[PDB]
Amino acid sequence: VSSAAVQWSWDAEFEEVSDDSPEFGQPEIPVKKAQGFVPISIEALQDEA
Amino acid sequence: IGMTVEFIPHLFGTNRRPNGSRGWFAYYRMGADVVNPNAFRLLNVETAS
Numbered sequence: 001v002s003s004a005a006v007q008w009s010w011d012a013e014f015e016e017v018s019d020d021s022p023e024f025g026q027p028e029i030p031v032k033k034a035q036g037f038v039p040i041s042i043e044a045l046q047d048e049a
Numbered sequence: 050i051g052m053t054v055e056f057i058p059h060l061f062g063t064n065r066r067p068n069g070s071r072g073w074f075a076y077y078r079m080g081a082d083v084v085n086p087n088a089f090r091l092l093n094v095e096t097a098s
Contacts, residue, residue, distance in 0.1 A: 011069070013069070014068055014069065014070055015062075015068055015069070016061075016062030016063060016064055016066045016067070016068040017066050017067055017068065017069070018066075019066070
């Protein structure tokens, strides 16, 4: 969740205040996948050192 | 009802927003009249109009 800061102002005596509504936002992060694969032979896995 | 005073905490402005002011409200109630107008005598000095 992200947001800004309220905006103040300088006002004189007997002056109505402005509307200061902060605006929010939401960052978002997806998750991906990576893979590898190396085959091997029964002869090779056994005879190679 | 006798004199009663209330303290308004927030006055508003044209756009229905606080303007930074406060007030005091005070009121009372009564009423009166004459039941019989013959039980009195009053003197009237009429000047030239």
